[PDB]
Amino acid sequence: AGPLSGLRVVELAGIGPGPHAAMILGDLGADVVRIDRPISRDAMLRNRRIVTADLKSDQGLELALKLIAKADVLIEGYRPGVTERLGLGPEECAKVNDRLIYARMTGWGQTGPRSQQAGHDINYISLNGILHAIGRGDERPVPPLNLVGDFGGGSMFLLVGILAALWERQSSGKGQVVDAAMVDGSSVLIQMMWAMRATGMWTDTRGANMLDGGAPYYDTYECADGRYVAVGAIEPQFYAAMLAGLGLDAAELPPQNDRARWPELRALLTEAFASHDRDHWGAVFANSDACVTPVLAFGEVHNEPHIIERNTFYEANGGWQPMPAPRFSRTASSQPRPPAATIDIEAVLTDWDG
Amino acid sequence: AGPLSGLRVVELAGIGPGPHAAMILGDLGADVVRIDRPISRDAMLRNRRIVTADLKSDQGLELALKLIAKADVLIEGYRPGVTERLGLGPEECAKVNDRLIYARMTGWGQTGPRSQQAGHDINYISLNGILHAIGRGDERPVPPLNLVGDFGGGSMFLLVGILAALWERQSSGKGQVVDAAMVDGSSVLIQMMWAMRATGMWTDTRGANMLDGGAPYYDTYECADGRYVAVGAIEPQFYAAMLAGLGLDAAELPPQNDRARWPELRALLTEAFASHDRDHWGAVFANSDACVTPVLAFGEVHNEPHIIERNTFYEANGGWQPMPAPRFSRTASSQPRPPAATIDIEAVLTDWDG
Numbered sequence: 001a002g003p004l005s006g007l008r009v010v011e012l013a014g015i016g017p018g019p020h021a022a023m024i025l026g027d028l029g030a031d032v033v034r035i036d037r038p039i040s041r042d043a044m045l046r047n048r049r050i051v052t053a054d055l056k057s058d059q060g061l062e063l064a065l066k067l068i069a070k071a072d073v074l075i076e077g078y079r080p081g082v083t084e085r086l087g088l089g090p091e092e093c094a095k096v097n098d099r100l101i102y103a104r105m106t107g108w109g110q111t112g113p114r115s116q117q118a119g120h121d122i123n124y125i126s127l128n129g130i131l132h133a134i135g136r137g138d139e140r141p142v143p144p145l146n147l148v149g150d151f152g153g154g155s156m157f158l159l160v161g162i163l164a165a166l167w168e169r170q171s172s173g174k175g176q177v178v179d180a181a182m183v184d185g186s187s188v189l190i191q192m193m194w195a196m197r198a199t200g201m202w203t204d205t206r207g208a209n210m211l212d213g214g215a216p217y218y219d220t221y222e223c224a225d226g227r228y229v230a231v232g233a234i235e236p237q238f239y240a241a242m243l244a245g246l247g248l249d250a251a252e253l254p255p256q257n258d259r260a261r262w263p264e265l266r267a268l269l270t271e272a273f274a275s276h277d278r279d280h281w282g283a284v285f286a287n288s289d290a291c292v293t294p295v296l297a298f299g300e301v302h303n304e305p306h307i308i309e310r311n312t313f314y315e316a317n318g319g320w321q322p323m324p325a326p327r328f329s330r331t332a333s334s335q336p337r338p339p340a341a342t343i344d345i346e347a348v349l350t351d352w353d354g
Numbered sequence: 355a356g357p358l359s360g361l362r363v364v365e366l367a368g369i370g371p372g373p374h375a376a377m378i379l380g381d382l383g384a385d386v387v388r389i390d391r392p393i394s395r396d397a398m399l400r401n402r403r404i405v406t407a408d409l410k411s412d413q414g415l416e417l418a419l420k421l422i423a424k425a426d427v428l429i430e431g432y433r434p435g436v437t438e439r440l441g442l443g444p445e446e447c448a449k450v451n452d453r454l455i456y457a458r459m460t461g462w463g464q465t466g467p468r469s470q471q472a473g474h475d476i477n478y479i480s481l482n483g484i485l486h487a488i489g490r491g492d493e494r495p496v497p498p499l500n501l502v503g504d505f506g507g508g509s510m511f512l513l514v515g516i517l518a519a520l521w522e523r524q525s526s527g528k529g530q531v532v533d534a535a536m537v538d539g540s541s542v543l544i545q546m547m548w549a550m551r552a553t554g555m556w557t558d559t560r561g562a563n564m565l566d567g568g569a570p571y572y573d574t575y576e577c578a579d580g581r582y583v584a585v586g587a588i589e590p591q592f593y594a595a596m597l598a599g600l601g602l603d604a605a606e607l608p609p610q611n612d613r614a615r616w617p618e619l620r621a622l623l624t625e626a627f628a629s630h631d632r633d634h635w636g637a638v639f640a641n642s643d644a645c646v647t648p649v650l651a652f653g654e655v656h657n658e659p660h661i662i663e664r665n666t667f668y669e670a671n672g673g674w675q676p677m678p679a680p681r682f683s684r685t686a687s688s689q690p691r692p693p694a695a696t697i698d699i700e701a702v703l704t705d706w707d708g
C-alpha cells in the first residue's frame with residue numbers, strides 16, 4: 001500500500017546489503033520475489049515471496065529468466081562475473097527485458113584490482129579512510145557495526161540507484177545497470193568530512209574532532225547509575241541551555257570552543273553528569289534545547305514515549321522490529337508482512353503472466 | 355547528465371541531512387536550486403544554483419512560491435511548524451503545485467513529545483538503541499561520527515522517499531509529503547540487529563557481539579608500526595586463508611567460534627599482526643580471500659590502487675572529494691560542478707518559466 005505498489009522486483013538471495021535493499025522496496029509496497037538455492041525466522045526477510053531454483057540447472061535458469069522478463073528490477077550481490085557465468089548477466093537479461101533495472105550490489109565494484117576479492121563491511125570502510133576515523137584516540141579503531149558499509153553506504157545507494165534509474169526510464173523507456181559499490185557509497189556518505197578536511201575543519205587524528213567524541217559538548221557521559229546520556233549541544237544557545245540545566249556558571253568554565261582547555265571542560269561536565277542518574281537528566285532537560293538525551297539500550301527503546309507515540313516499532317511475533325521509513329502522507333506503507341512458507345515459482349509466473 | 359537529469363529541486367538551506375540529500379540529487383543530474391538567507395568553500399554545496407531570499411518578507415515568499423510552483427521536489431529541514439509559519443507549508447504549496455514532492459527532513463519527526471526539541475545526530479541515535487551499541491565494552495559509547503543519523507538513516511531515507519514518491523506520481527499524477535525522521539531511518543538502517551536480537555543472535559552488551567568488535571575475526575589489529583589492519587574473515591574458508599597468511603597452525607589455536615576462548619584467540623592474532631608493519635600485511639593479503647585490509651587514514655586514500663583505478667575520488671580544490679555514487683551504465687553522472695556565485699532568483703524563474 002506504500003508508494004512502490006505495482007513495482008516488480010526479483011532478488012537473488014545474498015547477504016548484507018542486497019536483502020536490506022530488497023526489504024525496503026517491499027516495505028514501501030513493491031512486489032518482491034526472492035530466489036534462493038533449493039518458514040524463515042529472519043525478520044529481514046519480511047515483505048517477500050520466497051521461491052527456490054537451482055540456477056545452475058537448465059530448468060532453474062529458464063524459470064529465473066521468465067521471472068526476470070516480467071520484473072522491473074533485479075538485485076544481485078555476488079562477486080562480479082557470477083551472474084554472467086550463470087547466464088543471468090546484464091547482457092542475457094537485456095535479451096528478455098530491456099526495461100530491466102539491473103542492480104549490482106558489491107563492496108569493491110564491478111572492476112578494479114580488488115573486484116574479485118572477498119570482504120565484509122569492515123574491509124570496505126578500511127580502504128577509504130572511514131574506519132580509521134572511528135573510536136577513541138588512544139585505542140585502535142572500532143567498527144561502527146556494519147552500519148556504514150553494508151547499509152548507509154551500501155543498500156541505501158543501491159536503492160537510490162534503482163529508484164533514480166526508474167525515473168530515467170519514464171522518459172527513455174529503457175533500463176540500465178546500476179553498479180553500487182560500498183567503497184563508493186560510503187565515501188559519498190562521508191562527503192562532509194572530505195569537504196571539512198579541505199578547509200581545515202576536520203583532521204585525520206582519531207578522536208580529536210568536533211563529531212567523533214573529541215568535543216566535550218558532542219559525546220556521551222556516564223551518570224551515577226552507570227547508564228549514559230548523549231550531549232550534542234553544538235550551537236552556543238543550546239550549549240548555554242545545557243550548562244543552565246546542570247546549574248553550572250559559564251563564568252567559571254573554559255570557553256566552549258577553547259580546545260586547549262577541553263580536558264578541563266570535559267572533567268567539569270563529567271563530575272556534573274556523574275552526580276545523578278540518567279533518568280534525572282531526562283527530567284532536568286525535559287522540553288529544553290539543551291540537546292541532552294538518554295542513551296537507551298535496545299531493550300528499553302519500546303518504553304520511550306517518543307518511540308511509542310510515533311509507532312517507530314511494531315511487535316513481530318517474538319520481538320520489536322522497525323516500521324517502514326520514511327513516511328508518506330497519502331500512500332502510507334503497511335505494517336510489514338512476516339516471512340512465510342516458500343511457494344512454487346510457477347505460481348508467481350501465473351500471477352505475473354510470465 | 356546522470357539519471358535524474360530534468361528533475362527540478364528547491365532546497366531550503368539547512369544543515370546536515372538536507373544539503374546532503376540535495377547534493378546527491380544534483381550529483382545524479384537534478385536541477386537543484388538552494389534558497390539561502392540574504393562563492394562557497396563547502397564542497398557539499400556542489401551541483402547547485404544558490405539564490406537568496408528573505409522568506410519572512412512578502413516579496414521573498416512570493417518569489418519562493420513562484421519557484422516552488424515549477425519544481426518537482428522541495429527539501430526542508432527546519433523544525434516542524436517553521437515552513438507553516440512562513441506560508442510555505444505543504445497545504446500552501448499544494449495550492450500552487452499538487453505534483454510537488456514535499457520532503458521534510460528532521461531528527462524526531464513531524465509530531466510527538468520530542469518533535470520541537472533541538473538536537474543533532476548523536477541525540478537521534480541515542481534514543482533508538484544504536485549509540486549504546488557502538489564502541490568498546492569497557493568504556494562509554496562512542497559516536498560513529500554523524501554517519502548513522504544524519505546520513506545513513508537521514509538523507510538517504512529522504513532520498514528513497516523522494517524518488518519512491520516520484521514513482522508513485524507516474525500513476526497518480528500527484529505528489530505528497532515525505533516525512534523522513536532520522537530516529538526512524540536509522541532504526542530501519544539497523545533492522546538486521548533487531549532481527550538478530552529476536553533469534554538470540556545479538557545481545558545488548560556493548561562490544562560483545564560478532565560485528566561490534568567483540569569477535570577476534572571481525573576487528574582491527576595494531577601492527578609493528580602502530581598502524582592498523584581490519585580483519586573481516588567471518589566465513590570459515592576466509593578465516594582459514596587469514597591464518598594461512600599469518601603462518602599460524604589452526605591445530606594450535608582455539609576454534610574460531612569458541613567464544614569462551616576468544617581472549618586467547620585474540621591474544622595470538624595480536625602477537626601475529628604485531629610482528630610486522632601494516633603495509634607488510636597489506637602486501638601478504640593484497641589478493642587473497644582472507645578479508646584483511648590495511649586501515650588507511652584519509653590522507654593515504656588517494657594513493658591506494660583500487661581507489662585510483664575506479665576514480666572513487668576527484669580533485670576539487672586543494673582536496674579530494676568523492677565522485678557520485680552509485681554508478682549508471684547508460685546515463686552516467688558528470689564530475690560535480692563546484693560551488694559558484696549566487697545568482698538572481700528571477701534568472702532561475704526565467705529559465706524555469708516561472
Ligand SMILES: CC(=O)CC(=O)SCCNC(=O)CCNC(=O)[C@H](O)C(C)(C)COP(=O)(O)OP(=O)(O)OC[C@H]1O[C@@H](n2cnc3c(N)ncnc32)[C@H](O)[C@@H]1OP(=O)(O)O
Pocket residue numbers: 211366367368369370371389390391392407408409410431432433435436439440459460461462471472473474475476500504
Ligand atoms: C550539524 C551537525 O553536525 C549534526 C546534525 O545532526 S545536523 C541536523 C540538525 N537537526 C535537524 O536538522 C532536525 C530539524 N531541524 C531542527 O531541529 C532545527 O532547525 C535546528 C535545531 C537544527 C536549528 O534550530 P533553530 O536555529 O532554532 O532553527 P529552526 O527552529 O529550524 O528555525 C529556523 C528559522 O529560520 C527561518 N529561516 C530559514 N530560512 C530562511 C530565509 N531564507 N529567510 C528568512 N528566514 C528563514 C525560519 O523562518 C525559522 O524562523 P522561526 O523560528 O521564526 O519560525
